């Protein structure tokens, strides 16, 4: 056969930039290159080059010398045009009372972009408002135009079609073999690594697909980690509630991984931090690295406890580390590169900002090396090893002080660029591990062999069942 | 349209002057595509867009792509050097300043047809002169 007409199911909503069309669905611009890479990787039995030679011999390549592209036609079309449109933010806000049926809110999500659309601004989709009965418990209002002008919407549709056309039959047979694994392994969308890309294929050519998610995850990923989330009754009602629990749990766990949780009242240390301070106990935080020089001049930061040193115990040290010295590297770069760090000064009146750049303009990006896969309400955390190109590379930190003023006849103006004149530790303050030069000798596979085994009472912080490790 | 041998001579001299033809009479292979793309952009988009695109030096391209605009200016200067007094009353015979931006020169001088004809002449001359050489 020359055509593959697959019907696939949506598990988690997709964040789509071109949502203004009712025909908005999966973009094959993401599927086709990733599917080509996956197919060639499977052809070479794990190696992309061997698979490229395989496709070269069988004449499946558009070009035999330049690129990875395979010769087939990808088409993704919606069968039923009804869409469930979601608003995705980072914080939790009161729900509106007047609300279209298509509109649901996944408030506590890893996707932290477009956080200002739930503000008091006139350009916010849901405008917050003071309550009259209680001078708390903010009120919610819905603006139709603002919801129409949003950059990105979380969309969920019914079963739709992905059509694969080629005149090469053997390529179609191998595509049929590997497509369920491809969709079970890859996520598509914005912040898709955190779970806004989850799809599974149900019917391939009008035939049901018995493809075990666990086995495919075991095959194509270095480590696969299952977490059984307590589905409190329901399971037949409020898929919105299910999504809220799932994404709040993901935000919980991933904030636990590379950072702490200074929220309500319970403190659990960053396991990314705890890994480096334990293995060869020299590498410490970039955050504590940053906060050290801010207090080197008079600038009191909000908080009651000093920055953490040591793996355990309730120790605090707003003082010298030790007579010898300490190792500082950009620990949080490997689990997702960041650019700008806000530090909350004691007075709300101003902020302090640290901004990061490659210091030679090489590493401007790093997608998180973790992938979150949610299939039929079960949470799986997967990942290969990190990219070693990020290891041992310096960075240049810009220290700025920013202040805001309360209206006075115009409005908010968070504009002060005093450009903090902190003394610098100096590049090459030590051998080239001082303040920069992302830490050498990291291992993601052993990082999660370490991450979810911690804390008193014996309960896993991330109550994950280790599947492949 | 017929390209004069004098125009080809000016193109050869300009290609050698703005370090495009090496001392071995060879040029990088990408410059032929550069010149063809410049001609296509000039006819399709216009003089201002094409000249702005190919005058850029922050372009991450595989070679010094502003060199064709430099060669263009050199050819036009050589063309304007041999203008007669009869031509100088109708045509702008002034020599284009070396440091001066070619796009800025075109814009400040309007969008006159004279500059468009000169640019097209020099582009075709660059094409032929590059064809005269070997591409290593």
């Amino acid at each position: 056969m020359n055509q593959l007409t697959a019907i696939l199911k949506q598990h988690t909503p997709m964040i789509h930039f071109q949502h203004n069309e009712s025909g908005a669905t999966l973009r094959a611009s993401e599927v086709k290159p990733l599917l080509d890479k996956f197919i060639l990787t499977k052809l070479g039995n794990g190696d992309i080059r061997e698979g490229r030679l395989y496709a070269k011999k069988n004449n499946w390549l558009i070009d035999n010398e330049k690129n990875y592209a395979l010769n087939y036609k990808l088409s993704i079309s919606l069968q039923k045009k009804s869409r469930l449109e979601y608003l995705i933010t980072s914080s939790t806000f009161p729900l509106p009372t007047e609300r279209p049926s298509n509109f649901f809110t996944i408030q506590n999500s890893p996707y932290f972009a477009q956080e200002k659309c739930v503000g008091i601004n006139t350009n916010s989709t849901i405008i917050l408002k003071k309550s009259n009965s209680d001078p708390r418990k903010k009120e919610a209002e819905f603006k139709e135009k603002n919801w129409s002008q949003i950059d990105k919407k979380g969309l969920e549709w019914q079963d739709f079609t992905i059509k694969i056309f080629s005149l090469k039959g053997d390529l179609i047979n191998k595509i049929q073999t590997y497509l369920p694994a491809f969709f079970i392994c890859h996520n598509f969308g914005t912040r898709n690594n955190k779970g806004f890309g989850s799809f599974t294929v149900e019917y391939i050519n009008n035939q049901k697909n018995i493809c075990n998610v666990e086995d495919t995850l075991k095959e194509n990923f270095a480590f696969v980690y299952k977490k059984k989330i307590a589905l409190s009754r329901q399971s037949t009602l409020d898929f919105i509630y299910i999504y809220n629990q799932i994404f709040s749990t993901i935000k919980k766990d991933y904030q636990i991984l590379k950072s702490g949780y200074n929220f309500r009242n319970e403190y659990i240390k960053s396991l990314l931090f705890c890994y480096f301070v334990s293995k060869y106990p020299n590498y410490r935080w970039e955050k504590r690295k940053m906060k050290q020089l801010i207090k080197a001049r008079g600038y009191e930061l909000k908080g009651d406890h000093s920055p953490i040193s040591g793996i355990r115990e309730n120790d605090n040290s707003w003082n010298d580390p030790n007579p010898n010295g300490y190792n500082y590297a950009y620990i949080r770069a490997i689990l997702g590169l960041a650019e700008q760090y806000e530090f909350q000064l004691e007075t709300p009146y101003q902020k302090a900002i640290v901004k990061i750049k490659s210091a030679n303009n090489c590493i401007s990006r790093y997608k998180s090396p973790l992938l979150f896969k949610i299939i039929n309400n079960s949470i799986y955390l997967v990942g290969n090893e990190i990219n070693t190109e990020i290891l041992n590379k310096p960075f240049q930190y810009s220290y700025i002080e920013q202040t805001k003023n309360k209206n006075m006849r115009t409005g908010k103006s968070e504009i002060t660029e005093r450009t903090m004149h902190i003394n610098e530790i100096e590049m090459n303050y030590k051998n080239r591990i001082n303040y920069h030069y992302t830490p050498t000798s990291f291992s993601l596979i052993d990082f999660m062999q370490y991450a979810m085994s911690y804390k008193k009472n014996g309960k896993n912080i991330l109550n994950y069942i280790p599947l492949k490790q | 349209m017929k390209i004069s041998k004098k125009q080809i001579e000016y193109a050869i001299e300009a290609l050698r002057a703005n370090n495009i033809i090496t001392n071995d009479n060879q040029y990088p292979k990408v410059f032929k595509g550069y010149i063809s793309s410049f001609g296509a952009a000039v006819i399709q988009s216009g003089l201002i867009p094409a000249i702005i695109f190919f005058e850029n030096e922050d372009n991450d391209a595989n070679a010094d792509r502003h060199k064709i605009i430099g060669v263009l200016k050199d050819i036009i200067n050589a063309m304007r050097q041999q203008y007669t007094v009869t031509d100088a009353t109708i045509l702008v015979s002034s020599q284009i300043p070396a440091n001066y931006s070619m796009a800025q020169y075109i814009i400040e001088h309007g969008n006159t047809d004279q500059l468009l004809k000169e640019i097209t002449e020099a582009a075709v001359a660059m094409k032929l002169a590059l064809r005269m050489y070997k591409s290593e």
Partner: protein, 314 residues
């Protein structure tokens, strides 16, 4: 001027996209490196792009009605949402921010977006077995190419016309008659003026409740996954837009393995020796059905492997 692109009050879309696009305003800079990245240039190009994508086309538009009168009845299909892209390789960029970096195909006189008939001809022929020339750099690809295309076109022909058996020679003759209007081995056939397959320019015919043009992003993430991707802006034909495909097709007569004209086929039929097992016919209606099935299978335009320019029935 605003919606409802008409011959009375509307700017030429091609003129806006190519000529008026890079116009010099008193306080707009895109010559220097600072100007191209500034938000003033971004706002200028945003306003231009809004003007481009603020036009609608009515079903009863006099332009499309004139097209229907000139080119016969149209074959109306609908646009899926990748969008539709044609003339993508045309040079349109200056290095600025917020501008369309890709070319678009606009009719010069009308300004309506269109697909040149050459594109339709090439796309339709690309799934016929003899769309590849031997040359000598093709030699390796040629055998497999013809085989798969023969099987595909054979199933399509058995689908669309009441013929239960076709051959490779018959497929060759049919393809050459349809596209080259000749024989596979050079020499021509004395065809009538009507007996000639013409592929007109496909036109946008109806933007029902929205505009016909949209703006879209392709972001090629580099071969270095640690460097910043490139957002590329371009102009696409909106989904759910009626594209009129105009053809002038005839009825093809195949006796034995050769293509016959109507004048020859009349005498062949009247000959005392005849074989209905050797006389094959493909009606112009069945030819249009074949072309429609090909178009539904593969689509039209650029980035079709990515999906752009795929159709359903209207």
């Amino acid at each position: 001027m605003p919606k409802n692109y008409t011959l009375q009050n509307a700017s030429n879309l091609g003129w806006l996209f190519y000529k008026d696009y890079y116009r010099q305003e008193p306080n707009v800079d895109f010559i220097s490196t600072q100007g191209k990245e500034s938000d003033t240039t971004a706002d200028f190009f945003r306003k231009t792009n809004q003007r481009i994508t603020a036009y609608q086309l009515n079903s009863e538009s006099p332009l499309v009605a004139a097209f229907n009168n000139h080119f016969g009845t149209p074959l109306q299909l609908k646009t899926i949402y990748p969008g539709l892209i044609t003339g993508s390789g045309l040079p349109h960029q200056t290095g600025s921010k917020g501008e369309f970096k890709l070319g678009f195909q606009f009719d010069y006189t009308t300004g309506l977006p269109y697909i040149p008939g050459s594109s339709i001809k090439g796309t339709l022929r690309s799934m016929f077995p003899f769309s590849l020339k031997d040359k000598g750099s093709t030699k390796r690809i040629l055998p497999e190419y013809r085989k798969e295309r023969m099987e595909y076109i054979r199933d399509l022909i058995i689908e669309v016309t009441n013929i239960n058996e076709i051959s490779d020679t018959e497929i060759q003759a049919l393809e050459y008659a349809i596209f080259t209007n000749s024989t596979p081995s050079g020499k021509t056939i004395e065809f009538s003026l009507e007996e000639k397959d013409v592929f007109y320019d496909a036109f946008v015919a109806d933007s029902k409740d929205g505009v016909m043009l949209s703006d879209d992003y392709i972001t090629p993430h580099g071969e270095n996954p640690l460097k910043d991707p490139k957002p590329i802006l371009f102009l696409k034909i909106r989904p759910d837009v009626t594209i009129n495909f105009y053809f002038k097709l005839c009825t093809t007569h195949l006796y034995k393995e050769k293509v016959c004209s109507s004048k020859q086929i009349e005498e062949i039929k009247k000959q005392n020796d005849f074989s209905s097992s050797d006389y094959k016919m493909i009606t112009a209606h069945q030819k249009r059905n074949l072309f429609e099935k090909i178009l539904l299978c593969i689509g039209i335009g650029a980035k079709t492997n990515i999906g752009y320019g795929q159709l359903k029935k209207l």
